[PDB]
């Protein structure tokens with residue numbers, strides 16, 4: 001269709017950029033397997049609170065990320081983007097279970113319509129949320145392995161945002177008032193990361209209190225993203241700009 005055909009040269013240029021500037025990392029390289037130990041089923045010991053040494057703010061933030069991450073040139077991009085997201089989820093899970101920093105039972109227990117433009121706009125904001133969250137988190141982590149891991153993730157999220165946001169720029173050029181309306185509607189309705197997670201109210205409040213991510217960070221990044229599209233004085237969006 002017509003939008004897909006408009007976007008293909010932009011998808012190509014961005015895929016080309018993303019590949020030529022790639023600096024590939026592996027989840028397994030950020031996991032201190034030497035510290036791992038058998039659980040009680042295999043003759044070791046089960047988890048208990050004494051095994052966790054990281055601040056609860058840091059582990060709450062990581063559990064939120066993990067939950068979110070677990071859930072044609074364009075096809076080439078979606079496949080690449082998907083694999084990067086997946087990579088993040090593996091690294092986080094493996095770090096967490098090897099180090100025993102959280103109760104692994106909790107996170108392993110099986111018992112517990114958008115237009116195309118609307119979708120690209122949503123993803124640009126959502127990746128920017130990811131990038132701010134992981135940047136702020138990495139900056140508060142003193143444990144160097146984990147700090148390294150989260151910093152890798154943050155750098156990928158910057159790249160994700162750049163890619164989606166560039167597609168949105170081409171949408172603003174091809175089909176302006178549609179794109180603006182989509183930005184207005186997302187700006188009004190976006191919530192903090194993990195707002196949809198059942199029973200995470202306490203964890204969200206804790207990561208907000210630490211300044212990693214909350215309503216103030218969300219409000220500012222929304223203003224910055226609108227501004228970065230050159231839309232800061234656009235009449236229907238000035239109410240989301242600080």
Ligand SMILES: [Mn+2]
Pocket residue numbers: 085127130156157160
């Ligand atoms: Mn991402």
